[PDB]
Each structure stands twice: as C-alpha cells, then as structure tokens.
Design a protein around this ligand. Structure first.
Ligand code: K81
Length: 268
C-alpha cells in the first residue's frame, strides 16, 4: 500500500495555498512535495475528493507524470509526491521568458504528448492541462501534474476557474452535460503548442474575460496561428490547427499526435 506510516512526513516551507489545499516542500525519504487537503476536520466532500485524487495518482507510473509517492490521513489528509527542482512551462514562457531553441520546444511538446497518451490509456482525463501543470524538472524533463489549488478533484462541468484560455469551445460554453473528453485535453494541448511556438498566451489583445468566454464558445474567436515563430515546422503548425479544431471529433488523439511530433523531430 501507499499509506505512509504516521509521524514520518515533516513539512517545511509553504510553496502554495488555495481553496482546495496547501502545498509544502517537505521531507520523507528525501525532498518531497506535500499537499494538505484539509486544515480542520475534513468534510465528506474533502474526504471523497482526496480518495479520488489518490485513486487517480496511484494508477500512474510514467517519467512524464509527477511521481505519486504516498498518502497520509493522520494528522491531516496529505498527498506526497516527488520534489522537482526547476519551474513550470508557464513560468519559463510567460514570467522569466526563457528563449528555448526550436529543438527543445518540440521535445517539451513530445514529452507532454508522451505523458498525456499515458493518462488517456489509463482512462484519466486531465481536465486542466495548461503550461502551469507541465513542470520542467531540472528545466529538461516534463512532469505533468495538477499543481492548482483553486479546483476540486472528480465530477465535471458550478464551474468558476481561470484556465479559460486552455478550454475547448464545448468546455468554455459551461453546459450541464459533462464537456470533458480526451478531445478537450487535446484542445488544451493545442493551446500549449501555441504557447511553445509563439511564446505567448492566446487572445493577448482582448482585455475582457467575458468576451473571450462568449466568443471562443460561439466559435467567433480562435488562436491566431500566424503568430508562430518562423522556425516552427509546417507539420507542427498543421498539428496545432488539428488539435484546435472546433468540432471535437475532428481532433487527433494522443497516439496520432505523438507519432506526428516524433516524425517532425526526426526530420529537423
Ligand atoms: C504535492 C501534490 C500532491 C498531489 C498533486 N496532484 C496532482 O498532481 C494530480 C492531481 C490530479 N490528477 C493528476 C493527473 F496528472 F493525473 F492529472 C495529478 C499535486 C501536488 C503538487 C502541487 C504543487 O503545487 C505547487 C503550488 O501550485 N506542486 C507540486 N510539486 C511537485 C514537484 O516539485 C514542485 C512541487 C506538487
């Protein structure tokens, strides 16, 4: 089992906090990351979202997926994962503005498609794929996770969460019927491809969030693919357009995406 014996995990510096949890850099067989899902006695919702997140993570054993290490219920509900030196893709592209070579951008894309293909084969829909959830371990290896603390685990689009730029037209329309599919994860991956190849977030010239929501959902607005840097291969721009298709069934799945990136990478 993955239940860590009591009084083994130690917690150090607070790395983040939100409505749905607090993350610390901790110690348990070396450096680890610890997520405290509750503070006071947990609600039945918190216990269930904990059981569901642990259920998802315990099924993952892949180099491009954040390493789940274990869990604790005493004294608080905790999830222990590996600790990674580095920064997320978001930090690199939009905060410190790292100028990666085209070969590295294609490799980050390949490693993300690699981890995504794995999750989909295990019937795990990410539901929140974006550059912030793509960690660059030692600024070289992609480690996909869900580092967000604004959202809860399980169920599917209540809403209320700013990951709108990576939302497929069918997800951004905020309908009662569950809009989440493998294809909505592919659209989010297409947005990540846009960020890699442009170095920008889409719709940067629109200052109104409700207008972005309305227009993407209605198909009036889509990413400007002419913004992709000159050295972006024609196959990559073609793949990006395929992933961003408004009709979800027209979107390629990750075994196809992965084969397209692997062929692209060999032909540089
Ligand atoms: C500790 C923790 C526990 C569970 C989870 N859960 C998932 O990752 C998850 C949930 C649902 N599904 C999946 C899916 F991948 F299958 F989709 C994955 C995350 C963390 C966590 C939070 C976070 O946040 C930092 C503050 O934002 N930083 C990290 N780092 C680890 C690497 O070193 C830098 C710090 C780890």
């Amino acid at each position: 089992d993955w239940e860590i014996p009591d009084g083994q995990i130690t917690v150090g510096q607070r790395i983040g906090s939100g409505s749905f949890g607090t993350v610390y850099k901790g110690k348990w067989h070396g450096d680890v990351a610890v997520k405290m899902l509750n503070v006071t006695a947990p609600t039945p919702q918190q216990l269930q979202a904990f059981k569901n997140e642990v259920g998802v993570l315990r099924k993952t054993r892949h180099v491009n997926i954040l390493l789940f290490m274990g869990y604790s219920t005493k004294p608080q509900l905790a999830i222990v994962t590996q600790w990674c030196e580095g920064s997320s893709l978001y930090h690199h592209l939009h905060i410190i503005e790292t100028k990666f070579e085209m070969i590295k951008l294609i490799d980050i894309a390949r490693q993300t498609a690699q981890g995504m293909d794995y999750l989909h084969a295990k019937s795990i829909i990410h539901r929140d794929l974006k550059s912030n959830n793509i960690f660059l371990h030692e600024d070289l290896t992609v480690k996909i996770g869900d580092f967000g603390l604004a959202t809860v685990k399980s169920r599917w689009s209540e809403q209320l969460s700013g990951s709108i730029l990576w939302m497929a037209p069918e997800v951004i329309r905020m309908q009662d019927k569950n809009p989440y599919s493998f294809q909505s994860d592919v659209y989010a991956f297409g947005i990540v491809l846009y960020e890699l190849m442009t170095g920008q977030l889409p719709y940067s010239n629109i200052n109104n969030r409700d207008q972005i929501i309305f227009m993407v959902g209605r198909g009036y607005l889509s990413p400007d693919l002419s913004k992709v840097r000159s050295n972006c291969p024609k196959a990559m721009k073609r793949l990006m357009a395929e992933c961003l298709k408004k009709k979800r069934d027209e979107r390629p799945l990750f075994p196809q995406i992965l084969a397209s990136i692997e062929l692209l990478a060999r032909s540089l």
